[PDB]
Design a protein around this ligand. Structure first.
Ligand SMILES: *[C@@H]1O[C@H](CO)[C@@H](O[C@@H]2O[C@H](CO)[C@@H](O)[C@H](O)[C@H]2NC(C)=O)[C@H](O)[C@H]1NC(C)=O
Ligand SMILES: *[C@@H]1O[C@H](CO)[C@@H](O[C@@H]2O[C@H](CO)[C@@H](O)[C@H](O)[C@H]2NC(C)=O)[C@H](O)[C@H]1NC(C)=O
Ligand SMILES: *[C@@H]1O[C@H](CO)[C@@H](O[C@@H]2O[C@H](CO)[C@@H](O)[C@H](O)[C@H]2NC(C)=O)[C@H](O)[C@H]1NC(C)=O
Ligand SMILES: *[C@@H]1O[C@H](CO)[C@@H](O[C@@H]2O[C@H](CO)[C@@H](O)[C@H](O)[C@H]2NC(C)=O)[C@H](O)[C@H]1NC(C)=O
Ligand SMILES: *[C@@H]1O[C@H](CO)[C@@H](O[C@@H]2O[C@H](CO)[C@@H](O)[C@H](O)[C@H]2NC(C)=O)[C@H](O)[C@H]1NC(C)=O
Ligand SMILES: *[C@@H]1O[C@H](CO)[C@@H](O[C@@H]2O[C@H](CO)[C@@H](O)[C@H](O)[C@H]2NC(C)=O)[C@H](O)[C@H]1NC(C)=O
Ligand SMILES: *[C@@H]1O[C@H](CO)[C@@H](O)[C@H](O)[C@H]1NC(C)=O
Ligand SMILES: *[C@@H]1O[C@H](CO)[C@@H](O)[C@H](O)[C@H]1NC(C)=O
Ligand SMILES: *[C@@H]1O[C@H](CO)[C@@H](O)[C@H](O)[C@H]1NC(C)=O
Ligand SMILES: *[C@@H]1O[C@H](CO)[C@@H](O)[C@H](O)[C@H]1NC(C)=O
Ligand SMILES: *[C@@H]1O[C@H](CO)[C@@H](O)[C@H](O)[C@H]1NC(C)=O
Ligand SMILES: *[C@@H]1O[C@H](CO)[C@@H](O)[C@H](O)[C@H]1NC(C)=O
Ligand SMILES: *[C@@H]1O[C@H](CO)[C@@H](O)[C@H](O)[C@H]1NC(C)=O
Ligand SMILES: *[C@@H]1O[C@H](CO)[C@@H](O)[C@H](O)[C@H]1NC(C)=O
Ligand SMILES: *[C@@H]1O[C@H](CO)[C@@H](O)[C@H](O)[C@H]1NC(C)=O
Ligand SMILES: *[C@@H]1O[C@H](CO)[C@@H](O)[C@H](O)[C@H]1NC(C)=O
Ligand SMILES: *[C@@H]1O[C@H](CO)[C@@H](O)[C@H](O)[C@H]1NC(C)=O
Ligand SMILES: *[C@@H]1O[C@H](CO)[C@@H](O)[C@H](O)[C@H]1NC(C)=O
Ligand SMILES: *[C@@H]1O[C@H](CO)[C@@H](O)[C@H](O)[C@H]1NC(C)=O
Ligand SMILES: *[C@@H]1O[C@H](CO)[C@@H](O)[C@H](O)[C@H]1NC(C)=O
Ligand SMILES: *[C@@H]1O[C@H](CO)[C@@H](O)[C@H](O)[C@H]1NC(C)=O
Lengths: 138, 996, 49, 149, 49
């Protein structure tokens, strides 16, 4: 409140959620194509065959194992929820961006309590107690 | 009667030439669109200077009188035209109200279809006159338009003018202090002006220093709610303080036995004591004696004694001597006053008045224990080297002044901590809650909003503090409830503008302010400094980001032109400025199913553009010449600061060499200067606009657009590679890229026909190479046309190259700022060093010079530190540019969206000021159709899969085709491979698979 | 000041006595005894390498 | 001379500490640059006005050092992230990014340690001894065009 | 004046290709810094001794 202020971000978090939703919905229904041009639909188990060729594993390996592969994927997204639900320190990078700015502002504000060699840290004391020619020095 | 002033009354502010420039100046000016009084005469006030005009061709208007008495009683100006000359005199005159036509003198001087204009102003004892003549058609009002008045006369006559009158259709207005922005043309006449306070657009024009502004949102101001009222809250004590018993009593103590009186529970008046001539000194410390009546205290202690007149010098903080060492000491941070007087008749007597005597901070001890002058067994008994601790003052009234008795009162103050209980004589007011107000609680001054609170102060606690020491809550001294303080509401003020090119309308955003606080405060209908009255422009609307004034709220959601914050945007529409919640784009349900695929049947080649910075302007600074201006006295002080004026040059040398590295890393990718063949049979692709034009330095045509669309002690330095050397590298890179593919990046360049090189660029993106040859003319036409569109895009707007323009603009802004910081005072007596050297003795002059050295050194360190950060930011772009040239130009990158949008084919560099431009060429698929699809086909119970490409059907027949361009082929064995039987695969279908 | 004074083409108005740069630095003058306009340049300086 | 980069990282830290230590000997306008002179020649009311100049000058010296180290640390982190990337892509893989893992067509690379850094030995194929030939984009056989697989 | 390197007319035509017939494996050093000297300073003992 000492002349410090915080402005809002332009994209609100319910707008950010529409972008992350659109990127995800493109990636599911149309693979990479929606980066290269207008989105082209493809069945998802047919996208995964192209992704298998992309690592040099022959695409028949997917269909011959599709039910297993789906279960392994679904199981991993289960473990993701338990990991993120369990361990609050997992977001340590983001939480440091919050904490570093809190310490930066707290230090900037606390410095208003410093004297720097003046009679008082509180400017209205000097303006109450001293006449102009001395108050300038302080 | 009144008339509009329009834009009339601007005058040349100084006898200075300036040209092709916009200049900002503060002076007494007639504000635009003000009201000017009209006349067809009485005496008028002069005020802070006058704008005057008349329509004339009769020449009945003949002169002026200026002064205070207008005749007789004092010297007064007479200004008259007699057709032989203009005439001036300042006399104690002898003329009535109108001595003129039928239709001492300590200074004197000699020299409708039309209008005369004049300005009269009076500053520093000089009376100044400015003028213009014009033709006109309009008689009924002032001519709406512009023409700057020019100076005529400037005279040292010094008269304290408060009135004037005309001597016998004419008009009068008053000047006021304002900031104006003025436009000077190529011949240095003033030709246009802006009155910065007039409206939000005028604030914006002055903020940007421009007569036009582009579409956007700009901060111009800060808004704060003003204090509406004042409050004084003091303890309601009736009793008055007992100063007669302190100052005027019989028994002022002997100094080693000094008396202390506490004062409490009373109202004081220190001004009565301070105004008294009775005191030979009234010295004070952590308070000025003028301020004492405004303050309040928990305690005052009056310390009292008599002492010898020359010894009074010991009664201060930090002193030494026997009275301080053994009788009475002030602490070295004493808060109060010492008051003393020559009590010669009061405390001396003709016997040498032996009643007075002398022997840690506020110690007192009357002990008789002996001064031993050695380690003797004096045992408290008198003898040689064994002496009684007190000695007597010989106070006879006949003593010389330094040997007379003086009385001393020391006043020591204990501040407001606990409830103040000695206080100044101030009037208390009523208390007022919820308003923005000034307040004064027992001398604790501030500004804010006062409210109730739930803060459970313990009974000894008097006020709360925030982390910043600032008082957060107060007990009212007259009623022990706890009030919260809160600061008055404030925020940044921003102007939304459609572009002055397009419209004159604006809207104003009060960032973070609640609209209920706004339109009867510093915005409109109250004390409104600069953020002037329009309590509504038509609409006032509360957004999440702040109060928005003068824009029309809309329930639709368009794309965003002028972003405000929190999803709000504004734009100019069917007309008014609207505001709305933005849309992220067109919503699109993709036509997914578990069995359907869209395959493109056609494409476009596209040529994009990407622009990157690569180097700042190089610089070095002669920091001795900058800081000291080549003065020897300053140069000698600057030695005391050690290595600072050397590690600055070392830092800037690091920046300077790194620019030549950046430029060499980006362009020197190639070992030999390849040159183009004379023939141009590149399969119909037309590079003529990007290859060198030898008739031009030998830059390409597009490079010649790029080099035109971008446009002390401080020394600039040249780049190592010249602009013609950079053009040789961009030519060599381009000639290798055309004649040899990527091969010149892997040692020796191999020639290959350009149409075959493009067949391999296609073969890299999974399009089968025959698709190029079969479409070769079409592809060449799409490419040639796309290069054509780059010329039009770069021709279209100045905004096309904003990245490179920001390297130029920041370097100019930094250097101009570093130069303008020479003019700043930094609290010194002047910023012009020769003043300090000429006006002062060296002992004082050094302290003033040392502020300018400190200010300029702190300014120069500030500049160099921003160049380090700004150079690191440019180096990230130089490394990115060197990478894009390595992967896109010297190769074909498969990194999605690295070398332009779409599947990448190739790219061409072109040079530009401080940077590089890439023309990335990409394939984009463009005309899709839906098809039914299945992941495998079962033939003889064997499950088949395609080798490359995907199975599709048109609804009756099954084909395989490549993933990126529809080209159906019959499913022969050689398109496919088997793996196992049908049953494990989902969605497999039956068809013939043909055997050749 | 100090500088190389030079003859110049600048077109000052009759009342104007001296000219200023974009950065407010004084850089041209009317000679008060012969009302032509001079152009002012600082005397040369530079790093020695 | 190949190690000029790593030796320059050693040199800049040596010059930074030498500059910081030299500035202890600067007066900044105090009666002496040695703090115990001030404290032994002067009584406190005088001494604090002198000491405050050394405190100010030494503090401004120290902030200048820390700011240049903050910038230089970020400038080294950009190199550490690039080295971490080259080790993931060139050592642990085979990068197709042109001129990324050494000039030529990249085969593999090996790390070697060095004081304050890392050295990569990039192994690369470079073609040589080229011959001219006549060429055509396609061939007619039985009236149909042919192209190479 | 520095030389940017030898000039080279690539022998282009719509029908000529050059193809290599031998190769060199080549080993190239690249050197990258990774860490500074970890340094710490007592700001009381430096300033006030
Ligand atoms: C490959 O490994 C997976 C586990 O990672 C095996 O899948 C499991 O197989 C058993 C029977 O052997 C089933 O009971 C489990 O339900 C399977 N797990 C899941 C997640 O479905 C798989 O059998 C292995 N395949 C081979 C050929 O060894
Ligand atoms: C308490 O008693 C001691 C003596 O026991 C006092 O000491 C004197 O302090 C002053 C400092 O201004 C010295 O100049 C004297 O020389 C000291 N006296 C002796 C005999 O050494 C001390 O000041 C007393 N403190 C208080 C607050 O009364
Ligand atoms: C692929 O798209 C191109 C345009 O990008 C089409 O070319 C145009 O074809 C129409 C006739 O259908 C002509 O009027 C235009 O003049 C052509 N433009 C150019 C640049 O030549 C092309 O026909 C499309 N291909 C297919 C198979 O539909
Ligand atoms: C390559 O394209 C350029 C334009 O980008 C062509 O130049 C124009 O040619 C016509 C016919 O000679 C002239 O009327 C124009 O004045 C030329 N324009 C300019 C700006 O000079 C050029 O002819 C094309 N060449 C080939 C081989 O396709
Ligand atoms: C699916 O593709 C096939 C082959 O292109 C189409 O079959 C041809 O259809 C035309 C008439 O439209 C006949 O003249 C040809 O003799 C057919 N050729 C063959 C090999 O059968 C078929 O029409 C397409 N079907 C759909 C629904 O578009
Ligand atoms: C592909 O065609 C075969 C026959 O050529 C189908 O196989 C028969 O399917 C029915 C119904 O499931 C069974 O009663 C028969 O015993 C099967 N015969 C054989 C030889 O296997 C098969 O179902 C077809 N596949 C699809 C996806 O339609
Ligand atoms: C002041 O000026 C405005 C036009 O700018 C006019 O409408 C208004 O009537 C004037 N008021 C007076 C008292 O002259
Ligand atoms: C005008 O005034 C001058 C003195 O200022 C005087 O000599 C002259 O005669 C006057 N001219 C006329 C026409 O009266
Ligand atoms: C003339 O000037 C003197 C001061 O210079 C003043 O005392 C005197 O009153 C003046 N007389 C008239 C007639 O103005
Ligand atoms: C102007 O007024 C001041 C007092 O306010 C007086 O001393 C001075 O002489 C006056 N000057 C003139 C020329 O009227
Ligand atoms: C500027 O002055 C010159 C003569 O000095 C004249 O030829 C030219 O027309 C003038 N231009 C403008 C814009 O006033
Ligand atoms: C002290 O006494 C004198 C008269 O003897 C008087 O003028 C003065 O105001 C008195 N001061 C106080 C504080 O009583
Ligand atoms: C003083 O304060 C008390 C307590 O609020 C109140 O009752 C009394 O009326 C006040 N008197 C005056 C003269 O202000
Ligand atoms: C304002 O900009 C538009 C394009 O945004 C342009 O069409 C119009 O001509 C411009 N206004 C003026 C005065 O030229
Ligand atoms: C603005 O202030 C009023 C009270 O003056 C309150 O009713 C309203 O809810 C506030 N709105 C916001 C967004 O703060
Ligand atoms: C916009 O929506 C609000 C309610 O959210 C409604 O009061 C207003 O009338 C609407 N405007 C139009 C033009 O429908
Ligand atoms: C594909 O089919 C769906 C309906 O099944 C339709 O919405 C979509 O527009 C079609 N796409 C094309 C390119 O025709
Ligand atoms: C496709 O979806 C429909 C409806 O969900 C279902 O009847 C059909 O069996 C599915 N086919 C495949 C191959 O998954
Ligand atoms: C100054 O006097 C000389 C003759 O002595 C003359 O030529 C010159 O023009 C004069 N200059 C001015 C500005 O009066
Ligand atoms: C290929 O032939 C041309 C002459 O047609 C010659 O200049 C060039 O050097 C030859 N290149 C090779 C690789 O032999
Ligand atoms: C390739 O070059 C090597 C020397 O680098 C040589 O010994 C060898 O015989 C050459 N091989 C061919 C096929 O020319």
């Amino acid at each position: 409140f000492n002349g410090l202020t915080v402005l809002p971000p332009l994209l609100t978090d319910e707008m950010i959620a529409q972008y992350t939703s659109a990127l995800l919905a493109g990636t599911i229904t149309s693979g990479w194509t929606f980066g290269a041009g207008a989105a082209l639909q493809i069945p998802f188990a047919m996208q995964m065959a192209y992704r298998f060729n992309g690592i040099g594993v022959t695409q028949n390996v997917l269909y011959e194992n599709q039910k297993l592969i789906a279960n392994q994927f679904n199981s991993a997204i289960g473990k993701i929820q338990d990991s993120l639900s369990s361990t609050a320190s997992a977001l340590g990078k983001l939480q440091n961006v919050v904490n570093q700015n809190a310490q930066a502002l707290n230090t900037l504000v606390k410095q208003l309590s410093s004297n720097f060699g003046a009679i008082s840290s509180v400017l209205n004391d000097i303006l109450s107690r001293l006449d102009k020619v001395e108050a300038e020095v302080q | 009667a009144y008339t509009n002033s329009f834009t009339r009354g601007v005058y040349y502010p100084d006898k200075v030439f300036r040209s092709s420039v916009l200049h900002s100046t503060q002076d007494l000016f007639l504000p635009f669109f003000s009201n000017v009084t009209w006349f067809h005469n009485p005496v008028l006030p002069f005020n802070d200077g006058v704008y005057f005009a008349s329509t004339e061709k009769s020449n009945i208007i003949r002169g002026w009188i200026f002064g205070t008495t207008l005749d007789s009683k004092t010297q007064s100006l007479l200004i008259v035209n007699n057709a032989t000359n203009v005439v001036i005199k300042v006399c104690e005159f002898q003329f009535c109200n109108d001595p003129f036509l039928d239709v001492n003198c300590t200074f004197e001087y000699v020299s409708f279809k039309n209008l005369r204009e004049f300005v009269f102003k009076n500053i520093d004892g000089y009376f100044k006159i400015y003028s213009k003549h014009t033709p006109i058609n309009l008689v009924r009002d002032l001519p709406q338009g512009f023409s700057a008045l020019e100076p005529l006369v400037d005279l040292p006559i010094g008269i304290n003018i408060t009135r004037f009158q005309t001597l016998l259709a004419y008009y009068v207005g008053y000047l006021q202090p304002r900031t104006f922005l003025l436009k000077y043309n190529e011949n240095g006449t003033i030709t246009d002006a802006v009155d910065c306070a007039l409206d939000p657009l005028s604030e914006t024009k002055c903020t940007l220093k421009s007569f036009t502004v582009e579409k956007g949102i700009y901060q111009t101001s800060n808004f704060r709610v003003q204090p509406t009222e004042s409050i004084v809250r003091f303890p309601n004590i009736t009793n008055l303080c007992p100063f007669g018993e302190v100052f005027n009593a019989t028994r002022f103590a002997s100094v080693y036995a000094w008396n202390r009186k506490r004062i409490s529970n009373c109202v004081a008046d220190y001004s009565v004591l301070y105004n008294s001539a009775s005191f030979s000194t009234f010295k004070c410390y952590g308070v000025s004696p003028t301020k004492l009546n405004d303050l309040c205290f928990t305690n005052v202690y009056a310390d009292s004694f008599v002492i010898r007149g020359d010894e009074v010098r010991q009664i201060a903080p930090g002193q030494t001597g026997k009275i301080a060492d053994y009788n009475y000491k002030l602490p070295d941070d004493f808060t109060g006053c010492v008051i003393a007087w020559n009590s010669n008749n009061l405390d001396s007597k003709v016997g040498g008045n032996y009643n007075y005597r002398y022997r840690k901070p506020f110690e007192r001890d009357i002990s008789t224990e002996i001064y031993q002058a050695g380690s003797k067994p004096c045992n408290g008994v008198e003898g040689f080297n064994c002496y009684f601790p007190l000695q007597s003052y010989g106070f006879q009234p006949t003593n010389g002044v330094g040997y007379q008795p003086y009385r001393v009162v020391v006043l020591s103050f204990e501040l407001l901590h606990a409830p103040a209980t000695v206080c100044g004589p101030k009037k208390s007011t009523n208390l007022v809650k919820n308003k923005c107000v000034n307040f004064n609680f027992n001398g604790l001054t501030g500004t804010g909003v006062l409210t109730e609170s739930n803060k459970k102060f313990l009974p000894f606690q008097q006020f709360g503090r925030d982390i910043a020491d600032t008082t957060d809550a107060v007990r009212d001294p007259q009623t022990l409830e706890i009030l919260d303080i809160t600061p008055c509401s404030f925020g940044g003020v921003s102007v939304i503008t459609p572009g002055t090119n397009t419209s004159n309308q604006v809207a104003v955003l009060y960032q973070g302010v609640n609209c209920t606080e706004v339109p009867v405060a510093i915005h409109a209908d109250q004390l409104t400094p600069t953020w002037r009255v329009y309590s509504t422009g038509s609409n006032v609307f509360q957004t999440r980001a702040g109060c928005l004034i003068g824009a029309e709220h809309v329930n639709n959601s368009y794309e965003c032109d002028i972003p405000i914050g929190a999803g709000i945007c504004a734009s100019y529409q069917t007309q008014s400025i609207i505001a709305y919640t933005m849309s992220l784009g067109a919503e699109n349900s993709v036509a997914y199913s578990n069995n359907s695929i869209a395959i493109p049947t056609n494409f476009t080649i596209s040529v994009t553009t990407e622009i990157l910075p690569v180097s700042m302007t190089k610089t070095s600074v002669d920091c001795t010449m900058y800081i000291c201006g080549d003065s020897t006295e300053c140069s000698n002080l600057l030695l005391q600061y050690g290595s600072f004026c050397t590690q600055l040059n070392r830092a800037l040398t690091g920046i300077a060499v790194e620019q030549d590295k950046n430029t060499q890393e980006v362009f020197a990718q190639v070992k030999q200067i390849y040159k183009t063949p004379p023939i141009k049979d590149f399969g119909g692709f037309n590079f003529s606009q990007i290859l060198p034009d030898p008739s031009k330095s030998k830059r390409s045509f597009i490079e010649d657009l790029l080099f035109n669309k971008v446009t002390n002690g401080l020394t600039v330095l040249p780049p190592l590679l010249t602009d013609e050397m950079i053009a040789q590298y961009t030519s060599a890179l381009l000639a290798g890229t055309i004649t040899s593919g990527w091969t010149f990046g892997a040692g020796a360049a191999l020639q290959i026909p350009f149409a075959m090189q493009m067949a391999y660029r296609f073969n890299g993106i999974g399009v089968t190479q025959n698709v190029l040859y079969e479409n070769q003319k079409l592809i060449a036409n799409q490419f040639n046309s796309a290069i054509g569109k780059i010329q039009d895009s770069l021709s279209s707007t100045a905004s096309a190259l904003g990245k490179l323009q920001n390297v130029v603009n920041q370097n100019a802004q930094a250097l101009n700022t570093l130069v303008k910081q020479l003019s700043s005072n930094f609290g010194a007596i002047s910023s012009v060093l020769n003043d300090i050297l000429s006006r002062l003795d060296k002992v004082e002059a050094e302290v003033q010079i040392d502020r300018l050295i400190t200010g300029r050194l702190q300014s120069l360190q500030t500049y160099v530190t921003q160049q380090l950060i700004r150079a690191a930011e440019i180096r990230a772009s130089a490394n990115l540019a060197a990478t894009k040239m390595s992967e896109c130009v010297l190769g074909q990158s498969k990194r999605v969206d690295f070398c332009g949008k779409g599947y990448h084919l190739m790219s061409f560099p072109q040079s530009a000021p401080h940077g590089v431009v890439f023309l990335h060429v990409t394939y984009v698929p463009a005309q899709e159709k839906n098809f039914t699809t299945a992941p495998a086909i079962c033939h003889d119970g064997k499950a088949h899969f395609p080798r490359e490409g995907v199975f599709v059907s048109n609804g009756t027949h099954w084909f395989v085709t490549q993933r990126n361009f529809y080209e159906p082929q019959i499913i022969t064995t050689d398109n496919t491979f088997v793996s196992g039987n049908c049953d494990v695969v989902i969605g497999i279908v039956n068809n013939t698979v043909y055997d050749p």
